[PDB]
């Protein structure tokens, strides 16, 4: 369970951690790739709204 917000209408997709393609960082915030329908879909998530699973998969792929 990693949650992706849509502040336009305030919806919530839930992405399975295993399905994630790769995790990258923008300043504070975090920004990863899906595997939607073999389409390489995306998802930005705010520093404030970063869960641990995602910060972890990042700190790996980083340092």
């Amino acid at each position: 369970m990693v949650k992706v917000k849509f502040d336009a209408t305030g919806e919530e997709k839930e992405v399975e951690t295993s399905k994630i393609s790769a995790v990258y960082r923008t300043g504070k915030d975090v920004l990863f790739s899906y595997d939607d329908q073999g389409k390489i879909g995306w998802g930005y998530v705010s520093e404030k709204d970063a869960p641990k699973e995602l910060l972890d998969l990042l700190a790996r792929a980083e340092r």
Partner: peptide
């Protein structure tokens, strides 16, 4: 400044009086 609604992503304006604000899209 923030997208309209309740507990929305909320960014602060630079000296530019520019803030940024990134929002996830549907397909």
């Amino acid at each position: 400044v923030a997208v309209q609604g309740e507990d929305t992503v909320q960014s602060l304006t630079q000296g530019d009086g520019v803030a940024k604000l990134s929002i996830n899209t549907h397909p």
